[PDB]
């Protein structure tokens, strides 16, 4: 190419958007924004493919252009605006609030939350620097910078934002015994307790996580998001509790849902 690309073919779109083959050649191609385009939901896919409020992209244009969608407390008229992990999508007209949280199969769930919960979110601090007359700074996982954080906040911690002010209320430290969600790789969407972290210098660290049923899995350090302190999550968790069932017991649950219902 002679410059940056603007299209996305539909087959090369991310798998967890769950687009299908035959409706078009192109995928929505997210705008640049706070989240990575392999790691986001564009607002057009959330609003007609997940919520079924629209049937075309033209109707998503009509819904968004009435200024009806607030993502993290601000109105977005962009239909390909990249919403991402733990963003609060709040539709005021229908009185719904949503948070984007991965399912146990690594896709964003349609997780409804109460408007008490819709005033905060958790972020993961990715960078700390001191800049220009000794003012300390944060950089979170969704491109927020915060001036003057608490000096105990370090890289890989998890802070809590109030969505109106933008300021930190409190935070969790990165330690063994805290609760996780995996935000990357094979183990994506799983939830458990930190038990170990082995440090390889010059390369990626590996964190071992233990499930609520005693299953254990590793990730890398960058695929780790500290949800809660100890065992209590600071947010509401989706339908499955981050416990990935095997295919045999998922089949057993799906068959037990048919011999009882009907």
């Amino acid at each position: 190419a002679r410059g940056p690309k603007k299209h996305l073919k539909r087959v090369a779109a991310p798998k967890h958007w769950m687009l299908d083959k035959l409706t078009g050649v192109f995928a929505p191609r997210p705008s640049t924004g706070p989240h990575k385009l392999r790691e986001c939901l564009p607002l057009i896919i959330f609003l007609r493919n997940r919520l079924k409020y629209a049937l075309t992209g033209d109707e998503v244009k009509k819904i968004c252009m009435q200024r009806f969608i607030k993502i993290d407390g601000k109105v977005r008229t962009d239909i390909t605006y990249p919403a991402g992990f733990m963003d609060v999508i709040s539709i005021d007209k229908t009185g719904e609030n949503f948070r984007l949280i991965y399912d146990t199969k690594g896709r964003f769930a349609v997780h409804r939350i109460t408007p008490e919960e819709a005033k905060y979110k958790l972020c993961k601090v990715r960078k700390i620097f001191v800049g220009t007359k000794g003012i300390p700074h944060l950089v979170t996982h969704d491109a927020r910078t915060i001036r003057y954080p608490d000096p105990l906040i370090k890289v890989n911690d998890t802070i809590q934002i109030d969505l109106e002010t933008g300021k930190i209320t409190d935070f969790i430290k990165f330690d063994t015994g805290n609760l996780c969600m995996v935000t990357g790789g094979a183990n994506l969407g799983r939830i458990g307790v930190i038990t170990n972290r082995e440090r390889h210098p010059g390369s990626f660290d590996v964190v071992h996580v233990k499930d609520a049923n005693g299953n254990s899995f590793a990730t890398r350090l960058s695929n780790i998001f500290v949800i809660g302190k100890g065992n209590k999550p600071w947010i509401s968790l989706p339908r499955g509790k981050g416990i990935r069932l095997t295919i045999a017991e998922e089949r057993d649950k799906r068959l037990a849902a048919k011999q009882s219902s009907g």
């Binding site: 001036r147 003057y148 608490d150 000096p151 105990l152």
Partner: peptide, 30 residues
């Protein structure tokens, strides 16, 4: 905005200074 955040940090910096300064001399005599 700038004057309020600079004061609120310096008020918060005193606690994180003196909590470390408590355990500074705590380990030495022990």
């Amino acid at each position: 905005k700038n004057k309020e955040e600079a004061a609120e940090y310096a008020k918060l910096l005193a606690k994180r200074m003196k909590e470390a300064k408590e355990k500074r001399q705590e380990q030495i005599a022990k």
